[PDB]
Ligand binder design. Structure first.
Ligand SMILES: NC(=O)c1ccc[n+]([C@@H]2O[C@H](COP(=O)([O-])OP(=O)(O)OC[C@H]3O[C@@H](n4cnc5c(N)ncnc54)[C@H](OP(=O)(O)O)[C@@H]3O)[C@@H](O)[C@H]2O)c1
Length: 738
C-alpha cells in the first residue's frame, strides 16, 4: 500500500489523467505500490466545501484538507499536477452553476447584504484564488530542465519569433508610490503576535487584523499601492500608448493575488471605460456591476436590460475602443480582450510568451503587434525590461545554443507574497496603519489614503535556511555559478540578504561562484552567460521563483511544462510537481472542437520517474527503483524518437505519446534483468504493444477531427470523458490482462 498521491485537477492536465493514469496504474500495480487519487480540482474543492447543501451521494471527502496534513508527515510522496487558481468571474462563478445547473445545489456570491450571504461569501472566498499550492508547498522549490530535455530542445528547436532592434514594445511601470517604493521591513525578535490597526485622521481606530503570530527570526514587511497614484499612472500609459501606436496590455497576477490585483485590475478597467461607465453610472449600479471582474462582467450582467438599453451601452462601449489604443486580445475572433476577465492574462505566462512572439500580442484585427506591457509595480517589472531590451539588442536566444537558468526558490510556509492575502486591506479612510506586537512595540507603520492597498508579508527563518542550503547544494552538484536575486533597495530583500550572507558561512563555499545581485543586475549577468552558452543557477524569492521558471524555460524548451520541478518537503516528504506550467485552457478548447489534445505530458513522466524513486529509496523497494529506472528510460526514448505531441490534427496527440510511454516502458522493463519477475510479468505486454503499434496509433488518430462533448468543463461527465480520452479499444484490452 505505500502511498503515492496522483492529484486530480482541472483542465488539460485533468483530461490527460484519464489517459495516463490507468497506464501509470498498471505498471506500479505488480510491484506492491499504491497509487491513489485525491480530487483537488476547482469543482471537487467546492463540492467538498458545502456538505450541508449536498445530498448523501453528491458529497466527496475534503482532500485539500487531507493532503494539507499528509504534506507535513515524512512519508509524503505527492505527484501534483497544475490546478486552476479560480477568479471570481466565470472561474469561481461559472463552475458554481456548471454544478447547480444540471447537477447539485450550492449557493451564490458577491456583495453580501444578509447574514447568510456574508457567511457564504466568506466561505467561497477561501475557495477562489491560490488555495491548493500554498498548502501543499511545505518546502523550497528546485526547478531545472533535465539534460536530456535540454538536449532534445537543442536538436529539435521550437520556433522563435524574429526580433527587431527597432521594436516599439516595452514594459511600463509606476515611478512613485507603489508596493516596491513603499516597503518597510522589520525583524521579529520574540515569539508572539502582532496586531494590524488603522489610525484615522478623525482620531478613531479600526482594527484590520488583531492577532497574527510571528516566530523568532521572522521577517515582516508592509507596503501599499496608492490608488490615486496608480490611477494617475494607468491614465498616462493609456494616453501615451495611443501616441506610440501600440497595444495596451496589463500583466498582473489577479489569480494568486486574490486580494489586491483584482482591485488594481478594476481601477484599470475603470480608468479605461470611464466615459461609458460614467454615462451609465446607475444602470450598472442597479444590476450590480463589479469592475474588479473585468469589463467582461458588464457584458454578462446587462443581458437582463431592455433590448434597446443594451445596445446603447454596447454602442457606447465601442465609442471608447475608438477613443483609446487597442487592447491586446485574449481571443481576437470572439472579441475577448485583455480587460475582459481577471485571469485570462497572467503575468508569469503572458510575458514569456509575449517575449517569444517578437515582443507582440494579438490585436483586435487578428495579427501580432508591438505592445506596452503594463507591470504597475517595480519589484519585478525591471527583470522583464532587461530581457526585453536584450532581445531588440541581440536577437532571440537560440534554443540550439543558449544555456539554462534553473531556480532554487524560496516558498516554504507560504513564504512572502504567496501568503499576504489575509493581511491585505483596502484602506477605509485616510489615516495611518500600525503593526504592533504583544508588548505594544511599534514594529511597522505606513501612512495611508482611502482606497489604497496595504499589505504585510512575512518570510520565516526556517524556510530561508532550508533555502540557502538547497541553493548551495545545487551550486555544488552542477558546479555552476549561482546568483541570489536580492535587491538592497527593498527593505525586505535587504534583511533577507543579511540572512543569506550569514548562512553561507555555514556551508562549503570553496570552488563555487556564488554571489548576490539585484534582480536587475542578476538578469544581466544571467542573460550574459546565457547567450554565450553558459549556465547559471537562479536563487530567488517566491514570486521570482515562478516568473523565471516560466520565463527562461519557455525560451529554451518552448514550455515550462517540459521540465523538472521537485519540492523537498521539510519533513522527509516529497512534492513532485509536473511542470513549471499550469493547466492549458486553450488546450481544452481545441480538444472540445477538433478532438486534439496538444498538452505535453513530459512534465508528468519526469514527476513519476521522480516519485517512483523517492519511494524505492526511502523504503525497502527495489522494484520501485526498477520501474522508475526504466520509466526514466522510456522517457528518453520519447525525446529520442520524437513521440511527443504535434500541434495540428493528424500526427500523435496525447494518448499517442501516452501509448509510446506505455510501449517503451513495457519493453524497457521486459528487457532488463534487475528484476526477472517484472521482466517476466511485462513481456506479455511488451510483445503486444509493438505488434499493435501501427493499429493502435491508427485507432487513436481515428478520433481526431470531430468535436467532443463531455457534458461540462469544470465537472465533466467522467464516463464520456474516459471514452473520449481512451478511444483505442485495442490498446485498452491489451492492458487489463497484464
Ligand atoms: N498549479 C500550478 O502550478 C499552476 C501554475 C500556473 C498556472 N496555473 C493555472 O493554470 C491556468 C492557465 O493559466 P495561463 O493562462 O497562464 O496558461 P498556461 O497554460 O499556464 O500557459 C502556458 C501556455 O504554454 C503551453 N503549455 C502549458 N502547459 C503545456 C503542456 N503541458 N504541454 C504543451 N503546451 C503547454 C500552452 O500554450 P500553447 O497554445 O502555446 O500550447 C499554455 O497556454 C490558470 O487558471 C492558472 O491559475 C496553475
Amino acid at each position: 500500500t505505500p502511498k503515492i498521491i496522483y492529484t486530480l485537477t482541472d483542465e488539460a492536465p485533468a483530461l490527460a489523467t484519464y489517459s495516463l493514469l490507468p497506464i501509470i496504474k498498471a505498471f506500479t500495480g505488480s510491484s506492491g505500490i499504491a497509487v491513489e487519487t485525491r480530487d483537488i480540482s476547482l469543482a471537487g474543492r467546492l463540492i467538498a466545501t458545502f456538505p450541508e447543501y449536498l445530498t448523501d451521494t453528491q458529497k466527496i471527502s475534503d482532500d485539500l484538507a487531507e493532503l494539507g496534513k499528509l504534506a507535513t508527515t515524512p512519508d509524503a510522496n505527492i505527484i501534483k499536477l497544475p490546478n486552476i487558481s479560480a477568479s471570481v468571474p466565470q472561474l469561481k462563478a461559472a463552475i458554481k452553476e456548471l454544478q447547480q445547473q444540471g447537477y447539485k445545489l450550492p449557493d451564490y456570491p458577491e456583495e453580501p447584504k444578509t447574514d447568510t450571504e456574508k457567511d457564504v461569501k466568506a466561505r467561497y472566498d477561501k475557495i477562489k484564488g491560490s488555495a491548493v499550492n500554498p498548502v501543499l508547498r511545505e518546502g523550497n522549490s528546485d526547478r531545472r530542465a533535465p539534460l536530456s530535455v535540454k538536449n532534445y530542445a537543442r536538436k529539435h528547436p521550437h520556433k522563435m519569433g524574429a526580433w527587431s532592434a527597432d521594436s516599439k514594445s516595452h514594459v511600463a511601470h509606476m515611478d512613485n508610490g507603489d508596493f516596491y517604493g513603499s516597503e518597510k521591513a522589520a525583524l521579529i525578535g520574540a515569539p508572539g503576535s502582532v496586531k494590524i490597526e488603522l489610525i484615522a485622521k478623525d482620531g478613531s481606530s479600526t482594527v484590520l487584523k488583531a492577532k497574527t503570530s510571528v516566530q523568532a527570526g521572522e521577517i515582516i514587511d508592509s507596503s501599499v499601492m496608492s490608488k490615486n497614484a496608480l490611477r494617475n499612472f494607468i491614465a498616462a500609459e493609456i494616453e501615451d500608448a495611443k501616441k506610440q501606436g501600440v497595444l495596451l496590455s496589463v500583466h498582473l497576477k489577479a489569480t494568486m493575488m486574490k486580494v489586491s490585483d483584482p482591485i488594481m485590475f478594476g481601477q484599470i478597467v475603470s480608468e479605461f471605460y470611464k466615459d461609458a461607465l460614467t454615462k451609465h453610472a446607475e444602470v450598472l449600479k442597479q444590476i450590480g456591476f463589479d469592475v474588479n471582474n473585468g469589463i467582461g462582467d458588464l457584458y454578462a450582467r446587462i443581458k437582463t436590460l431592455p433590448e434597446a438599453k443594451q445596445k446603447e451601452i454596447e454602442a457606447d462601449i465601442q465609442a471608447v475602443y475608438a477613443q483609446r489604443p487597442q487592447l491586446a486580445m485574449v481571443n481576437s475572433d470572439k472579441g475577448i480582450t485583455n480587460l475582459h476577465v481577471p485571469s485570462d492574462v497572467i503575468v508569469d505566462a503572458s510575458m514569456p510568451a509575449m517575449i517569444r512572439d517578437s515582443g507582440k500580442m494579438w490585436g483586435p484585427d487578428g495579427k501580432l503587434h508591438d505592445t506596452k506591457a503594463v507591470i504597475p509595480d517595480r519589484c519585478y517589472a525591471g527583470v522583464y525590461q532587461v530581457v526585453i531590451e536584450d532581445c531588440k539588442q541581440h536577437g532571440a536566444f537560440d534554443p540550439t545554443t543558449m544555456g539554462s537558468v534553473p531556480n532554487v526558490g524560496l516558498m516554504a510556509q507560504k513564504a512572502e507574497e504567496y501568503g499576504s492575502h489575509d493581511k491585505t486591506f483596502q484602506i477605509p479612510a485616510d489615516g495611518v496603519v500600525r503593526v504592533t506586537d504583544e508588548s505594544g512595540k511599534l514594529l511597522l507603520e505606513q501612512s495611508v489614503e482611502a482606497g489604497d492597498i496595504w499589505r504585510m508579508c512575512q518570510a520565516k527563518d526556517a524556510p530561508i535556511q532550508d533555502w540557502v542550503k538547497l541553493a548551495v547544494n545545487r551550486a555544488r552538484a552542477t558546479n555552476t555559478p549561482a546568483v541570489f536575486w536580492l535587491d538592497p533597495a527593498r527593505a525586505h530583500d535587504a534583511q533577507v540578504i543579511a540572512k543569506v550572507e550569514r548562512y553561507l558561512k555555514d556551508y562549503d563555499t570553496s570552488g563555487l561562484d556564488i554571489r548576490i545581485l539585484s534582480p536587475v543586475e542578476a538578469t544581466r549577468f544571467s542573460l550574459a552567460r546565457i547567450r554565450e552558452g553558459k549556465d547559471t543557477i537562479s536563487v530567488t524569492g517566491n514570486v521570482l521563483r515562478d516568473y523565471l521558471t516560466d520565463l527562461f524555460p519557455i525560451m529554451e524548451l518552448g514550455t515550462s511544462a517540459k521540465m523538472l520541478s521537485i519540492v523537498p518537503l521539510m519533513s522527509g516528504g516529497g512534492l513532485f510537481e509536473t511542470g513549471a506550467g499550469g493547466s492549458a485552457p486553450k488546450h481544452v478548447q481545441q480538444f472540445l472542437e477538433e478532438g486534439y489534445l496538444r498538452w505535453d505530458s513530459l512534465g508528468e513522466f519526469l514527476a513519476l520517474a521522480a516519485s517512483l524513486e523517492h519511494l524505492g529509496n526511502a523504503y525497502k523497494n527495489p522494484k520501485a527503483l526498477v520501474l522508475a529506472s526504466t520509466l526514466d528510460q522510456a522517457t528518453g526514448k520519447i525525446l529520442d524518437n520524437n513521440k511527443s505531441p504535434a500541434r495540428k490534427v493528424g500526427e500523435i496527440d496525447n494518448r499517442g505519446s501516452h501509448f509510446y510511454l506505455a510501449l517503451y516502458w513495457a519493453q524497457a522493463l521486459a528487457a532488463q534483468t534487475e528484476d526477472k519477475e517484472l521482466q517476466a510479468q511485462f513481456t506479455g505486454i511488451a510483445k503486444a504493444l509493438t505488434d499493435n503499434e501501427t493499429k493502435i496509433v491508427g485507432e487513436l488518430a481515428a478520433a481526431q477531427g470531430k468535436p467532443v462533448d463531455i457534458a461540462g468543463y469544470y465537472h465533466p461527465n467522467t464516463d464520456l470523458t474516459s471514452k473520449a480520452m481512451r478511444p483505442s479499444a485495442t490498446f485498452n484490452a491489451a492492458l487489463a490482462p497484464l
